[PDB]
């Protein structure tokens, strides 16, 4: 199925730490990666969980603009389920089940996991842009041809859903290959000397094929609105660098933030037993995308307001657009705040 697709773009306002599994190796709590390549990633389970929680919390306040009507959980449930609805309302009061809209879209709760599946699917969020310190200029966005390759693959997958031939052609228009150390750099990052763009601890050579970079910016303008998540897109167009695969992988491993944290005793004035530990944080301004898919709503006796893939897609688009999300652990210490552009 999955007759409709919405691309979600995330911008990290603050450093984000999505907790990995067992805390092994030298670093205590590392970010989630993939052994297959080594790049950072966010598994779809956490994304679906946070989206479901936000959706349910919004629905409980009757702030969800269901076709600009502010659908009421109790009223809609009574209209749909009729006689038994009241009983379900009690289950909603006990925080056992969930209101009608979120149950229909994201699937039911644990105790009722035998009626219908979830009408949505949330893919893993993959990196697309990585901040990196630079000598001239500051804070250069970086990316690699493999990322663009995966992006083209995702576009092709979308085309198998909505027949977006123009998007496929636009993606196929871009084809670059930096060999070992040369980079495609914007005008700002270029050192005042002859080429020689210096990223972190590496000195590179610029390559004069910047049109491709421009095309990439166009793709962004095609995908995530006009302003680049609240900034002038052309402003970011001056600070984009494309580098080889191995260099990008090296950046995605030895440039995440590393932080040491301690606990202070009540009155001793110094650390205590089991107080010192380490954490790894994904840098701010990291751009990561995903792929949300929607198929046929499998819920029984769905409401007339939301009874087609187009309706669900519109609801998701309006509810999540320039909104804000809390992602991962370390919430109370200001970590995980992101801006979502659909």
């Amino acid at each position: 199925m999955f007759e409709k697709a919405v691309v979600f773009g995330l911008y990290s306002i603050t450093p984000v730490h999505a907790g990995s599994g067992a805390e092994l190796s030298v670093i205590d709590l590392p970010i989630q990666r993939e052994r297959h390549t080594g790049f950072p990633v966010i598994w779809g389970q956490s994304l679906k969980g946070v989206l479901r929680s936000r959706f349910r919390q919004l629905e409980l306040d009757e702030k969800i603009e269901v076709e600009s009507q502010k659908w009421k959980w109790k009223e809609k449930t009574k209209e749909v389920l009729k006689e038994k609805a009241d009983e379900f309302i009690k289950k909603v009061e006990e925080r056992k089940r969930d209101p009608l809209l979120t149950e229909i879209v994201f699937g039911p709760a644990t105790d009722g996991a035998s009626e219908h599946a979830g009408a949505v699917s949330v893919g893993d969020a993959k990196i697309l842009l990585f901040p990196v310190r630079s000598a001239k200029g500051v804070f250069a966005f970086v990316t690699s041809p493999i990322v663009i390759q995966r992006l083209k693959e995702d576009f092709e997958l979308v085309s198998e859903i909505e027949n977006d031939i123009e998007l496929k052609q636009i993606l196929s228009r871009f084809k670059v290959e930096l060999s070992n150390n040369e980079t495609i750099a914007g005008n700002a990052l270029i050192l005042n000397g002859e080429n020689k763009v210096i990223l972190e601890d590496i000195v590179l050579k610029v390559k004069s094929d910047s049109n491709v970079i421009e095309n990439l910016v166009e793709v962004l303008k095609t995908l995530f609105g006009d302003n680049f998540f609240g900034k002038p897109i052309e402003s970011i167009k001056e600070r984009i660098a494309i580098v080889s695969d191995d260099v990008f992988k090296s950046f995605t491993r030895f440039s995440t933030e590393i932080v040491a944290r301690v606990r202070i005793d009540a009155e001793k004035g110094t650390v205590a037993r089991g107080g010192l530990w380490y954490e790894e944080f994904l840098p701010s301004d990291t751009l990561m995308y995903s792929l949300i898919a929607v198929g046929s709503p499998k819920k029984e006796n769905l409401p007339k307001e939301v009874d087609n893939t187009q309706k669900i897609v519109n609801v998701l688009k309006v509810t999540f657009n320039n909104a804000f999300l809390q992602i991962g652990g370390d919430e109370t210490v200001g970590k995980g705040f992101v801006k979502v552009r659909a």
């Binding site: 190796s25 030298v26 670093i27 590496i202 191995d246 090296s250 491993r253 030895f254 590393i258 380490y278």
Partner: protein, 149 residues
């Protein structure tokens, strides 16, 4: 898991060898245990080359040229010097040859001096050497804390 067993055996062997020298002297045993514990922190902050340079610097001698071999830890005067020479010797030995030709891990440096190897190589060699040093240090921390006084 063969590499894991190799690392565990090597860590136990070096910690036992440290136990043999100045077994009663809790000064050398205590200093070495803290030195192994605090070592991985430096590597994360400053990289492998900087940590190796610091280890070379803390030794109190002319230290002409650079040699992972030689530099007998017992020849060092102060107990801290002996412990630091021991730590450097163990780490450099593991990175150079591991446990031997027939071992599962023959060492990434092909028997070469780790500092010279870092000085004349590519980036990826430095990366893998860094990761391997981090892993062996992680094992050595536990094994030295467990039994050494």
């Amino acid at each position: 898991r063969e590499i894991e067993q190799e690392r565990a055996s090597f860590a136990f062997k070096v910690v036992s060898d440290i136990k043999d020298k100045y077994s009663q002297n809790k000064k050398v045993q205590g200093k070495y245990s803290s030195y192994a514990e605090k070592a991985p922190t430096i590597i994360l902050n400053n990289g492998l080359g900087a940590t190796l340079a610091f280890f070379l610097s803390k030794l109190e001698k002319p230290i002409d040229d650079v040699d992972y071999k030689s530099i007998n830890p017992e020849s060092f005067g102060n107990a801290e010097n002996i412990a630091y020479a021991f730590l450097y010797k163990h780490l450099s030995t593991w990175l150079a040859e591991g446990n031997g030709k027939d071992s599962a891990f023959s060492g990434l440096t092909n028997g070469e001096d780790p500092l010279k190897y870092i000085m004349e190589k590519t980036a990826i060699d430095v990366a893998i050497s860094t990761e391997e040093a981090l892993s062996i240090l992680n094992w050595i921390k536990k094994f030295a804390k467990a039994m050494l006084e």
